[PDB]
Amino acid sequence: MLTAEEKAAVTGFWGKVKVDEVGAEALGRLLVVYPWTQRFFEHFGDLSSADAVMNNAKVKAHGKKVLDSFSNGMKHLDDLKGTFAQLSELHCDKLHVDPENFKLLGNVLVVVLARHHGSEFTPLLQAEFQKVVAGVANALAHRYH
Amino acid sequence: MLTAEEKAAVTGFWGKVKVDEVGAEALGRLLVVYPWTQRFFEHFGDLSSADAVMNNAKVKAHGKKVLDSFSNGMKHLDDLKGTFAQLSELHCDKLHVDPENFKLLGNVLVVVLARHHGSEFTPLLQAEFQKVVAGVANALAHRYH
Amino acid sequence: VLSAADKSNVKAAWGKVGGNAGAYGAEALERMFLSFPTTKTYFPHFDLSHGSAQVKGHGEKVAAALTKAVGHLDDLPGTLSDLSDLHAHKLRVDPVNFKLLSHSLLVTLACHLPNDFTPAVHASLDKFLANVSTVLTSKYR
Amino acid sequence: VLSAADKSNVKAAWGKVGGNAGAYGAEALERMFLSFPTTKTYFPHFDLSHGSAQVKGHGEKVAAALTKAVGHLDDLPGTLSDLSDLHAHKLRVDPVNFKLLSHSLLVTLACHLPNDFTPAVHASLDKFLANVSTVLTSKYR
Ligand code: HEM
Ligand code: HEM
Ligand code: HEM
Ligand code: HEM
C-alpha cells in the first residue's frame, strides 16, 4: 500500500480535514455531476436540482457516514481489504453498485479536498490520496471477486 | 475463485479448445477492433489493415504465448494472483498497459470461443469463463496496488 | 464515424440475422444477466429465468431498435434520441452497462454466425454498437 | 449535448482562469503524470520533472486548445476534429486516459478557484470536459 513516509504524509494531512462537511460536499457533488448515482438514493427525497441535492438533509447526514468510514480506513491503510469487508458485502450484494462508482466518488472527494485546501494540496500529496482512494475502491469491490 | 463444480464445467470445456488458434485469432481481433493497442506492438511489423494484422506471423506466435499462459491459469484457478506475478510485473512496471485492456482481451477471447464452438458455448458456460477472464485481469493488474 | 465498408458489413451482418433478430436479442440479454449479474437490478419487475415471456418481449424490442438503427446509419444520434431520454433520465442506466450488452450481442452474433463473423465484421459491428451506446449515454453531458 | 447555464458557467469559470490557462495546463499535466503514472509513457521524449520547459510548452498548447473549445461550445466535433485525428491515428492514446486528464484539470481548477467552483460549476465544467473528451476519442480505425 503506502510506504512508511506515505502513511505519515497522508495521516498528517488528514488531521487538518473538516471531515463532516467534505463528506456532505463530496456525496452532494457525486449526485449532481453523475446523475445516474441518484438511482441508489431515490428514497432520500427531492434530488431534482443542484440546489436540491446541496440542501438535502439526508445527503448531508449520509455524506458524514461515508467520510467517517473513510477516515476509519485512514487508520487501517495496511488492512483496507479487512476494514471494508462488511461494506463490500452491502454495496456489492445488497445495493449492487458497480465498482466504477467507488472510483468516481474517490475522485470527487479528491476534488473536494482540493477545493478546501488549495495549494497546500500539492501534486505529490494528491497522488498519495489517489492511491488511498484506489485502495478504498478495491476493498469495496472485492466481494465481486 | 469458482466452486468445485464450476471449475469442472470450465475444465471440461477447455479440453476442447484449440488454444494456439484461439490465441492467434484473439490477439488478432484485439488489434483490429481496438487500434490503440497496436501501439504496444509497433515492432511486430505491418499492422496497417485487417489482413495485415491477421496474417502477421509474429501476432500469431505471440497469440499462442498469451493463450498458453491462459491454459496455465486454468490449471491454477485457486491462485491466479501468484501464478501471474511475473507477468503482472511485466505488463505494469514495464509495458504500462492500462488494466482496462486485460478485460478487453478477455472479452475478445470469449468472443472467439463463441465463434469456435457455437451453441456449445452456452450462456451458463460463458458466465463461468467471464469470471475467469476477470480473475486473470485482476492478477495482471495487481502490481498497480 | 462508420466507413462505407462498415455500413455494408453491418447491413449485411444484420441481414443474415434477418427474422432471427428477436431471438438473438433475448439471448444477448440473458448472456448479459448471467455474465454480469449487477445488470439484473434494472429489471426487478421481470422474471429473468430462461425462456421467460418478459425477457422474450424485451428482446424483441431491443432487436427492433437495433434493426431501426441498421436502416439509419448516417443518423444514429437522431433516430435513437428518444431512447437516450428513457435510459438516462428515467431508468438511469450506469454508463458502463452499455458496453456489456454490446459484448453480449457480439458473443451472440459470433455463436450463430461463425462464418460471417470475420475480424473486419467483428470490428465494424463493435464500431456500430459503440456508436449506439454513445448516443444512449448522450443525455449525461 | 450541454445546457446554457452550462455554457455561461464554462465561459465564466474560464474567464476567472484567464492568462493562467497555460500555467494551469502544466499543473494538471503534472497531476496526471504523478497520480496516473501510465500516462507518462506517452511522453518518453519529455523531461517530466517539475518546472520543465517541455511540460510548460505542452501545458500552454493544451490550455490553448481548451481556450479554443470554450470559444466554440456549439461545434466541438468540428473544431476539435484535427486534434482527434492526431490523438487516435498518430498518437494512439488509449481512450481510458482522457478521464484522468479531465479529473487532473478539475483538481487543478479547484485548487485555484475555491470560491468559484460550486457544485453547479463543477458539473458544467465536467460536462464540458466530457464533451471535449468524447470528440477526441471519436475517430478510431
Ligand atoms: C468511497 C466509497 C464509499 C464508501 C467509503 C461508502 C461507505 C458507506 C457507508 C459507511 C454507508 C452506511 C452504512 C451504515 O449506515 O451502517 C454506506 C451506505 C450506502 N452507500 Fe456507500 N460508500 C461508498 C460508495 C458508495 C457509492 C459510490 C454509492 C452510490 C453509487 C453508494 C451507495 C450507498 C447507499 C445507497 C447506502 C445506504 C443509503 C440508505 O439507504 O440510507 N456507496 N456507504
Ligand atoms: C489476459 C490478458 C493477457 C495475458 C494472459 C498476457 C500474457 C502475456 C504473455 C504470456 C506474454 C509473454 C511473456 C514473455 O515472453 O516474457 C506477454 C507479453 C506481452 N504482452 Fe501481454 N498478456 C495479456 C494482455 C495484454 C494486453 C491487453 C496487451 C496490450 C494491449 C499486452 C501487451 C503485451 C506486449 C507488448 C508483450 C511483449 C511483446 C514482445 O515481446 O514484443 N498484453 N503477455
Ligand atoms: C444496445 C443498446 C440498447 C438498446 C438498443 C436498448 C433498447 C431498449 C428499448 C427499445 C427499450 C424500450 C422498451 C419499451 O418500450 O417497453 C428499452 C428499455 C429498457 N432498457 Fe434498454 N437498450 C439498450 C441497452 C440497455 C442496457 C445496457 C440496459 C442495462 C443493463 C438497459 C436497460 C433497460 C431497462 C431497465 C428498460 C425498461 C424495461 C421495461 O420496463 O420494459 N438497456 N431498452
Ligand atoms: C482535454 C484533453 C486534451 C487536449 C485538449 C489535448 C490537446 C493536445 C494538443 C494541443 C497537443 C499538441 C499539438 C501541438 O503540438 O500543437 C497534444 C498532443 C499530445 N497529446 Fe494531447 N490533449 C488532450 C489529452 C491527452 C491525453 C489524455 C493524453 C494521454 C495521456 C494525451 C497525449 C498527448 C501526447 C503524447 C501529445 C504529443 C506531445 C508532444 O510531442 O508535444 N493528450 N494534445
mmCIF file of N, CA, C and O and ligand atoms in Angstrom, chain D residues 32 39 42-43 45-46 58 61-62 65-66 83 86-87 91 93 97-98 101 132 136, ligand 4:
data_model
loop_
_atom_site.group_PDB
_atom_site.id
_atom_site.type_symbol
_atom_site.label_atom_id
_atom_site.label_comp_id
_atom_site.label_asym_id
_atom_site.label_seq_id
_atom_site.Cartn_x
_atom_site.Cartn_y
_atom_site.Cartn_z
ATOM 1 N N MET D 32 -1.576 14.683 -13.513
ATOM 2 C CA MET D 32 -1.827 13.441 -14.257
ATOM 3 C C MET D 32 -0.638 12.470 -14.297
ATOM 4 O O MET D 32 -0.835 11.261 -14.209
ATOM 5 N N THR D 39 0.404 7.330 -17.797
ATOM 6 C CA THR D 39 0.256 8.381 -18.786
ATOM 7 C C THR D 39 1.624 8.964 -19.139
ATOM 8 O O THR D 39 1.775 9.617 -20.168
ATOM 9 N N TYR D 42 3.311 8.121 -22.750
ATOM 10 C CA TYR D 42 3.000 8.827 -23.971
ATOM 11 C C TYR D 42 4.041 9.908 -24.271
ATOM 12 O O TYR D 42 4.137 10.403 -25.406
ATOM 13 N N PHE D 43 4.844 10.225 -23.253
ATOM 14 C CA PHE D 43 5.799 11.321 -23.327
ATOM 15 C C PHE D 43 7.198 10.843 -22.922
ATOM 16 O O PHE D 43 7.790 11.394 -21.992
ATOM 17 N N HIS D 45 9.901 11.237 -24.580
ATOM 18 C CA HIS D 45 10.824 12.294 -25.014
ATOM 19 C C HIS D 45 10.768 13.574 -24.171
ATOM 20 O O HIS D 45 11.517 14.524 -24.436
ATOM 21 N N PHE D 46 9.871 13.612 -23.191
ATOM 22 C CA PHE D 46 9.743 14.778 -22.326
ATOM 23 C C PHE D 46 10.602 14.597 -21.092
ATOM 24 O O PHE D 46 10.667 13.502 -20.507
ATOM 25 N N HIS D 58 3.878 22.312 -23.426
ATOM 26 C CA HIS D 58 2.760 21.448 -23.728
ATOM 27 C C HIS D 58 1.485 21.875 -23.007
ATOM 28 O O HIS D 58 0.396 21.853 -23.600
ATOM 29 N N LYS D 61 -0.239 24.649 -24.876
ATOM 30 C CA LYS D 61 -0.933 24.223 -26.071
ATOM 31 C C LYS D 61 -2.146 23.371 -25.741
ATOM 32 O O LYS D 61 -3.097 23.314 -26.528
ATOM 33 N N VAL D 62 -2.119 22.722 -24.577
ATOM 34 C CA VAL D 62 -3.317 22.065 -24.058
ATOM 35 C C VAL D 62 -4.322 23.141 -23.666
ATOM 36 O O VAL D 62 -5.450 23.161 -24.166
ATOM 37 N N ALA D 65 -5.879 24.815 -26.588
ATOM 38 C CA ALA D 65 -6.891 24.002 -27.262
ATOM 39 C C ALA D 65 -8.238 24.129 -26.543
ATOM 40 O O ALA D 65 -9.262 24.317 -27.185
ATOM 41 N N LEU D 66 -8.216 24.064 -25.210
ATOM 42 C CA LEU D 66 -9.422 24.226 -24.390
ATOM 43 C C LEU D 66 -9.959 25.655 -24.467
ATOM 44 O O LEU D 66 -11.178 25.870 -24.503
ATOM 45 N N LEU D 83 -7.391 17.619 -33.896
ATOM 46 C CA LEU D 83 -6.802 17.063 -32.696
ATOM 47 C C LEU D 83 -7.204 15.606 -32.453
ATOM 48 O O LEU D 83 -6.394 14.804 -31.954
ATOM 49 N N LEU D 86 -5.305 13.456 -34.631
ATOM 50 C CA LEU D 86 -3.969 13.370 -34.077
ATOM 51 C C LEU D 86 -3.882 12.338 -32.961
ATOM 52 O O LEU D 86 -3.033 11.440 -33.025
ATOM 53 N N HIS D 87 -4.750 12.464 -31.957
ATOM 54 C CA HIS D 87 -4.689 11.617 -30.763
ATOM 55 C C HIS D 87 -4.878 10.136 -31.062
ATOM 56 O O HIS D 87 -4.195 9.286 -30.487
ATOM 57 N N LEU D 91 -1.142 9.323 -32.563
ATOM 58 C CA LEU D 91 -0.677 9.158 -31.180
ATOM 59 C C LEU D 91 -1.108 7.871 -30.513
ATOM 60 O O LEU D 91 -0.440 7.419 -29.603
ATOM 61 N N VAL D 93 -3.612 7.296 -28.370
ATOM 62 C CA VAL D 93 -3.861 7.481 -26.956
ATOM 63 C C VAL D 93 -5.039 6.605 -26.531
ATOM 64 O O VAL D 93 -6.159 6.756 -27.028
ATOM 65 N N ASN D 97 -7.496 7.214 -20.973
ATOM 66 C CA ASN D 97 -6.636 8.263 -20.373
ATOM 67 C C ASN D 97 -7.259 9.674 -20.344
ATOM 68 O O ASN D 97 -6.940 10.510 -19.470
ATOM 69 N N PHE D 98 -8.160 9.930 -21.285
ATOM 70 C CA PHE D 98 -8.872 11.192 -21.283
ATOM 71 C C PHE D 98 -9.559 11.514 -19.935
ATOM 72 O O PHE D 98 -9.386 12.617 -19.417
ATOM 73 N N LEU D 101 -7.052 13.006 -17.420
ATOM 74 C CA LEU D 101 -6.626 14.411 -17.621
ATOM 75 C C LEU D 101 -7.694 15.402 -17.161
ATOM 76 O O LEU D 101 -7.372 16.461 -16.606
ATOM 77 N N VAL D 132 -15.587 17.408 -24.719
ATOM 78 C CA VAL D 132 -14.256 17.545 -25.304
ATOM 79 C C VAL D 132 -13.622 16.184 -25.487
ATOM 80 O O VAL D 132 -13.125 15.887 -26.564
ATOM 81 N N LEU D 136 -12.498 13.753 -28.898
ATOM 82 C CA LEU D 136 -11.105 13.309 -29.057
ATOM 83 C C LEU D 136 -10.931 11.778 -29.052
ATOM 84 O O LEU D 136 -9.828 11.276 -29.276
HETATM 85 C C1 HEM E 4 -8.655 17.709 -22.914
HETATM 86 C C2 HEM E 4 -7.781 16.763 -23.273
HETATM 87 C C3 HEM E 4 -6.628 17.026 -24.294
HETATM 88 C C4 HEM E 4 -6.395 18.083 -25.095
HETATM 89 C C5 HEM E 4 -7.217 19.388 -25.256
HETATM 90 C C6 HEM E 4 -5.193 17.800 -25.837
HETATM 91 C C7 HEM E 4 -4.612 18.607 -26.781
HETATM 92 C C8 HEM E 4 -3.371 18.384 -27.309
HETATM 93 C C9 HEM E 4 -2.563 19.356 -28.012
HETATM 94 C C10 HEM E 4 -2.971 20.827 -28.309
HETATM 95 C C11 HEM E 4 -1.427 18.730 -28.368
HETATM 96 C C12 HEM E 4 -0.192 19.323 -29.100
HETATM 97 C C13 HEM E 4 -0.293 19.565 -30.597
HETATM 98 C C14 HEM E 4 0.783 20.595 -30.866
HETATM 99 O O1 HEM E 4 1.996 20.288 -30.617
HETATM 100 O O2 HEM E 4 0.399 21.730 -31.309
HETATM 101 C C15 HEM E 4 -1.490 17.368 -27.889
HETATM 102 C C16 HEM E 4 -0.503 16.434 -28.068
HETATM 103 C C17 HEM E 4 -0.265 15.297 -27.352
HETATM 104 N N1 HEM E 4 -1.166 14.670 -26.525
HETATM 105 FE FE1 HEM E 4 -2.999 15.609 -26.028
HETATM 106 N N2 HEM E 4 -4.712 16.574 -25.467
HETATM 107 C C18 HEM E 4 -5.572 16.069 -24.532
HETATM 108 C C19 HEM E 4 -5.455 14.856 -23.896
HETATM 109 C C20 HEM E 4 -4.418 13.963 -23.951
HETATM 110 C C21 HEM E 4 -4.346 12.747 -23.187
HETATM 111 C C22 HEM E 4 -5.439 12.289 -22.198
HETATM 112 C C23 HEM E 4 -3.203 12.120 -23.497
HETATM 113 C C24 HEM E 4 -2.694 10.763 -22.923
HETATM 114 C C25 HEM E 4 -2.440 10.559 -21.620
HETATM 115 C C26 HEM E 4 -2.516 12.941 -24.485
HETATM 116 C C27 HEM E 4 -1.285 12.685 -25.077
HETATM 117 C C28 HEM E 4 -0.615 13.529 -25.953
HETATM 118 C C29 HEM E 4 0.753 13.381 -26.429
HETATM 119 C C30 HEM E 4 1.786 12.284 -26.091
HETATM 120 C C31 HEM E 4 0.980 14.561 -27.368
HETATM 121 C C32 HEM E 4 2.277 14.898 -28.155
HETATM 122 C C33 HEM E 4 3.251 15.614 -27.214
HETATM 123 C C34 HEM E 4 4.338 16.341 -27.965
HETATM 124 O O3 HEM E 4 5.074 15.681 -28.739
HETATM 125 O O4 HEM E 4 4.467 17.582 -27.788
HETATM 126 N N3 HEM E 4 -3.297 14.057 -24.731
HETATM 127 N N4 HEM E 4 -2.693 17.191 -27.253
#
